[PDB]
Amino acid sequence: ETREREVFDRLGMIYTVGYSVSLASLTVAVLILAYFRRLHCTRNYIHMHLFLSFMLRAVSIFVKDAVLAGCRVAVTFFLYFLATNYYWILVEGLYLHSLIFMAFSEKKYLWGFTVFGWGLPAVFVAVWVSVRATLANTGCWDLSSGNKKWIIQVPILASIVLNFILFINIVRVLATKLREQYRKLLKSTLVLMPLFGVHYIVFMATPYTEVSGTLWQVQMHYEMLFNSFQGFFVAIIYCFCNGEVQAEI
């Protein structure tokens, strides 16, 4: 009941403005990718799907914020959308460790990962039943931390982990190939990290931290600013400055 209320209000402020920017920044990308048939491929289709995932997550988080039963639909929808974006990040990682490294299968992956990116998290959200209505279903299942909500954080924590391993492997393979100047490697790392989802590779595990702690403060203000702004860090480097869309825009 301290100024931590102001902390929460500010934490809302940043993530509201972040998602407000991200929604338009990704809508423009989706429109330019869809209307322009020239800039079409499997890679651009996966980009469009991921942009839609970001947009849906932003819309869902805004709706949940506006909300605070019928609230139960909103909470589970927000969880499913957040999972679907965090999983489309891994879907993009899996394309690249297949596009260039290792692995055609054009029907596969473009269609094969569709099931993976939207369907696989949803499966866990549906598995979040016979428990939500079993224990502590007093209201809209507002997630009062009843220790029955790890089925939604384990698949996501796995999605982050696989992205980190994929990022490490790809940069290790590319740096050696690049070196057979060094600014090109740094540019590639800084232009691949936002889409590969390494920006939340750090701060990835804790049982839970009290609000008064400084570790909680830094973790929340990092993963509610970098994630909420991770629409301007992907759209601006994969819709406007990539090499192909800019020339044919």
Partner: peptide, 26 residues
């Protein structure tokens, strides 16, 4: 753990404590 999940969880916990721990309203 996912931060936004944590943010909503702690928002709910604070709301609950505002009626379970803040009983000195009267």
């Amino acid at each position: 753990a996912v931060a936004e999940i944590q943010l909503m969880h702690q928002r709910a916990k604070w709301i609950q404590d505002a009626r379970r721990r803040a009983f000195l309203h009267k």
